[PDB]
Amino acid sequence: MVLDIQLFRDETGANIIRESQRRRFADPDIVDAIIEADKKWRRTQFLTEASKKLINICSKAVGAKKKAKEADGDTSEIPPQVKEAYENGTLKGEQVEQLCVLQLKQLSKDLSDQVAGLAKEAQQLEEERDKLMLNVGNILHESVPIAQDEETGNTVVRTFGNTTKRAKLNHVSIMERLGMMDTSKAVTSMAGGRSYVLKGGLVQLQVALVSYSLDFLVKRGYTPFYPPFFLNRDVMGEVAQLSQFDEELYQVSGDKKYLIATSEMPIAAYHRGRWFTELKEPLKYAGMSTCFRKEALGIFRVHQFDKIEQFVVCSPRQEESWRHLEDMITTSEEFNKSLGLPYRVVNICSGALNNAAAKKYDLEAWFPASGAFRELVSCSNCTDYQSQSVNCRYGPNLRGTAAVKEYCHMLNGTLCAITRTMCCICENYQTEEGVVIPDVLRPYMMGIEMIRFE
Amino acid sequence: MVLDIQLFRDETGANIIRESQRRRFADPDIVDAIIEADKKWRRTQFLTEASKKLINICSKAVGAKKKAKEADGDTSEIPPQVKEAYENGTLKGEQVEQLCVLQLKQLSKDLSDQVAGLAKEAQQLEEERDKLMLNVGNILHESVPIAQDEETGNTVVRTFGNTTKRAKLNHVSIMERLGMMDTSKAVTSMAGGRSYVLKGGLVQLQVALVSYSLDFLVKRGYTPFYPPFFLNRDVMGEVAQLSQFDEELYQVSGDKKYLIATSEMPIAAYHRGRWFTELKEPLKYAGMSTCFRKEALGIFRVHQFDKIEQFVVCSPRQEESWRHLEDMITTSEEFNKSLGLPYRVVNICSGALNNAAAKKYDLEAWFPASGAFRELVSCSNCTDYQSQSVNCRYGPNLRGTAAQNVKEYCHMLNGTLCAITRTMCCICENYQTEEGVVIPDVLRPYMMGIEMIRFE
Numbered sequence A: 001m002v003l004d005i006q007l008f009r010d011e012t013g014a015n016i017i018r019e020s021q022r023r024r025f026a027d028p029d030i031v032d033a034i035i036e037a038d039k040k041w042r043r044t045q046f047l048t049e050a051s052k053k054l055i056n057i058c059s060k061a062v063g064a065k066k067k068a069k070e071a072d073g074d075t076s077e078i079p080p081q082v083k084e085a086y087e088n089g090t091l092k093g094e095q096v097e098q099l100c101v102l103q104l105k106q107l108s109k110d111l112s113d114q115v116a117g118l119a120k121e122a123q124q125l126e127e128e129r130d131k132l133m134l135n136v137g138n139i140l141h142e143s144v145p146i147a148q149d150e151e152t153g154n155t156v157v158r159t160f161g162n163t164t165k166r167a168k169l170n171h172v173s174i175m176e177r178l179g180m181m182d183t184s185k186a187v188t189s190m191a192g193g194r195s196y197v198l199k200g201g202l203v204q205l206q207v208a209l210v211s212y213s214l215d216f217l218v219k220r221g222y223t224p225f226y227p228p229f230f231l232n233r234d235v236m237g238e239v240a241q242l243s244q245f246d247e248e249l250y251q252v253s254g255d256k257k258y259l260i261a262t263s264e265m266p267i268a269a270y271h272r273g274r275w276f277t278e279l280k281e282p283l284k285y286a287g288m289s290t291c292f293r294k295e296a297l298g299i300f301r302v303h304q305f306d307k308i309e310q311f312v313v314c315s316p317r318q319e320e321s322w323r324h325l326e327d328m329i330t331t332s333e334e335f336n337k338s339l340g341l342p343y344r345v346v347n348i349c350s351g352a353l354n355n356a357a358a359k360k361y362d363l364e365a366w367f368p369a370s371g372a373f374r375e376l377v378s379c380s381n382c383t384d385y386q387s388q389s390v391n392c393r394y395g396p397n398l399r400g401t402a403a404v405k406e407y408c409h410m411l412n413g414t415l416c417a418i419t420r421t422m423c424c425i426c427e428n429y430q431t432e433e434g435v436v437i438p439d440v441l442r443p444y445m446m447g448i449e450m451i452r453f454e
Numbered sequence B: 001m002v003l004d005i006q007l008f009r010d011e012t013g014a015n016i017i018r019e020s021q022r023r024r025f026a027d028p029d030i031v032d033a034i035i036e037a038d039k040k041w042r043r044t045q046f047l048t049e050a051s052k053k054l055i056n057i058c059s060k061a062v063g064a065k066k067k068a069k070e071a072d073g074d075t076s077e078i079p080p081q082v083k084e085a086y087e088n089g090t091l092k093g094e095q096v097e098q099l100c101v102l103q104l105k106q107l108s109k110d111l112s113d114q115v116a117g118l119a120k121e122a123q124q125l126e127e128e129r130d131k132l133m134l135n136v137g138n139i140l141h142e143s144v145p146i147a148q149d150e151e152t153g154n155t156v157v158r159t160f161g162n163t164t165k166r167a168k169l170n171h172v173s174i175m176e177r178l179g180m181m182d183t184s185k186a187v188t189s190m191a192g193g194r195s196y197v198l199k200g201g202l203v204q205l206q207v208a209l210v211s212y213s214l215d216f217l218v219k220r221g222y223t224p225f226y227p228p229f230f231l232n233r234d235v236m237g238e239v240a241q242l243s244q245f246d247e248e249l250y251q252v253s254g255d256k257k258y259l260i261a262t263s264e265m266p267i268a269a270y271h272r273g274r275w276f277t278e279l280k281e282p283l284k285y286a287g288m289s290t291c292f293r294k295e296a297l298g299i300f301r302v303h304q305f306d307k308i309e310q311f312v313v314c315s316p317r318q319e320e321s322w323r324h325l326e327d328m329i330t331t332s333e334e335f336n337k338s339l340g341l342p343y344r345v346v347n348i349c350s351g352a353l354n355n356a357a358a359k360k361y362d363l364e365a366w367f368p369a370s371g372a373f374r375e376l377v378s379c380s381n382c383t384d385y386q387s388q389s390v391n392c393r394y395g396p397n398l399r400g401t402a403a404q405n406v407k408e409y410c411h412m413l414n415g416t417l418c419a420i421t422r423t424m425c426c427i428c429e430n431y432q433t434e435e436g437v438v439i440p441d442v443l444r445p446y447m448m449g450i451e452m453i454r455f456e
């Protein structure tokens, strides 16, 4: 499953999607292609259900005839009119009951063959529909800036700290001069491009950030969550876009699995097929994992890195998820303030948003030696988009309920991308002697106040 | 390279290896098979060197004759006695100079063909020699118990705490009742068999153990080391036996790589092609990594787990590595004593040792509800076995040093400090009450001062 079809079948709903597509500078005609694919699919289903019912009538009519000792009949040959009627979904049970046992047996096999063919057609139409749904963006929030390009289109909403100060050495030079980061051929000849070894004080800093970040979220009511780092193909497909398989995900062979690019992937997948009748309190998770990205200088952009993640599952009602999005970006802001790191928060323009996000805020920290704002955090409200894909339902779940389906809302937000935060700390806390440890991290690394240049 | 050939070429050295093979219940005949392959290899090299010199004589002779403007000659045919002589390694330079330019050009090509043929033979002999070397165990320490079966053959060296203690619930039952571990189909249908999710207090305990273990080693002079979790095929081959690729290692495709089974693999590989003239102080690394094992209830035996590792690179002289082995097992013991976990330390029997280990100590903690000693730690002295494979040299080079007749290699050791999920299982059984799991005192500052994690 990719998206629920329900909004596409509704005239008003389809227009909401077309409008959102236009506002994202995406194709509104994808809605119409989905409606058409679904129309063809609904036709295979109408015929399948009609023919399944007629198969049961054949079985019951044969049973009645056998009990009555009616002769089996002259022939099994099916009238062309009967074949035309079941192919068009107009064959009535009263007409089927006019056939002899031999014809009823032949018809049951013919209808079973038709159901088998219609199932193959339906599977192809579901594949076409699903491929189109992957190109449908989530319905934009009304506050999303309307623009194609990030450089001019994104809106700066807040800033913190000294964002104009400059510094001498960039994070690459600092980590080299500490003697605590190795990205030389000794490492890349054994592990490939962009691989690294961290030593001594930088490992202590890495662990101090992992533990401080986890405690920061525990204090805010998040439940720590340590996931498996592998996901099977089917499950990864529900939490990843098709473009992620070719550009971002490593394949593991032990069956075929994929390494996770973020704990958001197994946390969202952990909710698949779930149904929360009510969520008076949201589900809040502090994901902790290594992240693996194929990405097809230093430790700013690497294939392997730790990240502490915020993940929320909440009620889709009363715009509650929008309140959670504000709390999640505020949490990431408070985290950076606690580390004394200057930054700006940016509202991502419509054209730059990934399909699952209805709105996204990035926190870009100031790197004084690099002289630039660099992304440390992304916080998104995915509303019911991922829930539709993992099939995470919401609402009353009682016996006797017939065919609007409600889904939970889901949000995800970086709390700390460990290696990038280390790069940021190094630039902001450098001195002539080394790197000053931010105050809040000192208890998490044996009270160490500074890591020295070698 | 698998092993250096030098000890096999020495009569005393070959006898030391045959004895060690017998004491490990391995084949001593492998030594003799290696000697024979190397004898055939040395013959290909003798002929190669002789023929390379003759190729240079051909080049020099063609040069001198052409500078003197001599005619090319009437034939390129090589006298049968010349072909017989170079094939036997007896062709003299004086016989070569007597040939004309045309014959010298033909001979240089024929000798180059012979060198190409001899290189193919040498490569086939190197493959044969290396395959045999993979079945040669490291020279056993004289204190290793001689037995084939781990079940009855290991020797108990030391015990700590109440190793007869009994408890109510096993680690699986405890982690289930805490509501902090999920090994159900909600996880296994996502990530395959033996996959798990940890939540809440158990993740806090997991992080507390990682951080306390790292600090425990920093305080003991180890340098923290965070490695890449991938190794390419060639490099993994130097730090893993062929049986590990089949049974233990996941393959990753992004240039084919392998997920590490332990930080011991990238730390050993990080020393490939290195040469230390002296190691007055050893290199001590505190490896920190996730570990991935194919393994072809609960979180005791899983594919994915954190482990804090001790790794030492030291001088091969004066049996210094044997002192480090004792320090490393003592470090793992002091760690488990600080957590208050009862255990026994065993000296692994000869038949159970992996090929790289000259000796191994396991620390098996007592699980009071399970009612069994269960391996938490392995500490091994690999002496120069892994160093020969990664080519990590020590001391003076052979040339220009009259006193140096042997190629020296560093010694390497590795030892678990903390296998995080198994230690969590042990803590749960040992610290359970009717309300939940008491946090060992030393870990409380590493998990927000929490004294107990409660049953759901």
Ligand SMILES: Cn1c(=O)ccn([C@@H]2O[C@H](COS(=O)(=O)NC(=O)[C@@H](N)CO)[C@@H](O)[C@H]2O)c1=O
Pocket (backbone or CB within 6 Å): A261, A262, A263, A264, A293, A299, A300, A301, A302, A303, A305, A307, A309, A375, A376, A377, A378, A379, A412, A413, A414, A415, A417, A418, A419, A420
């Ligand atoms: C080292 N490194 C990279 O090479 C690439 C990205 N990042 C940081 O990861 C943060 C989160 O990545 S994301 O923007 O794709 N969003 C997620 O994964 C969501 N689940 C929310 O976390 C980025 O903001 C980069 O700072 C690295 O650190």
Ligand SMILES: Cn1c(=O)ccn([C@@H]2O[C@H](COS(=O)(=O)NC(=O)[C@@H](N)CO)[C@@H](O)[C@H]2O)c1=O
Pocket (backbone or CB within 6 Å): B261, B262, B263, B264, B293, B299, B300, B301, B302, B303, B305, B307, B309, B375, B376, B377, B378, B379, B414, B415, B416, B417, B419, B420, B421, B422
């Ligand atoms: C969860 N789990 C496993 O499933 C398998 C093993 N272990 C622990 O890892 C320790 C070290 O593994 S080892 O014996 O193969 N030795 C090494 O890897 C060396 N580098 C020394 O660490 C074992 O003692 C198990 O307790 C798991 O925890």
Ligand code: NA
Pocket (backbone or CB within 6 Å): A170, A171, A369, A370
């Ligand atoms: Na820079």
Ligand code: NA
Pocket (backbone or CB within 6 Å): A362, A375, A377, A378
């Ligand atoms: Na981002």
Ligand code: NA
Pocket (backbone or CB within 6 Å): B162, B163, B164, B165
């Ligand atoms: Na006892």
Ligand code: NA
Pocket (backbone or CB within 6 Å): B170, B171, B369, B370
């Ligand atoms: Na048990």
Ligand code: NA
Pocket (backbone or CB within 6 Å): B362, B375, B377, B378
């Ligand atoms: Na072991």
Ligand code: NA
Pocket (backbone or CB within 6 Å): B397, B398, B399, B400, B401, B402, B403, B404, B405
């Ligand atoms: Na010498």
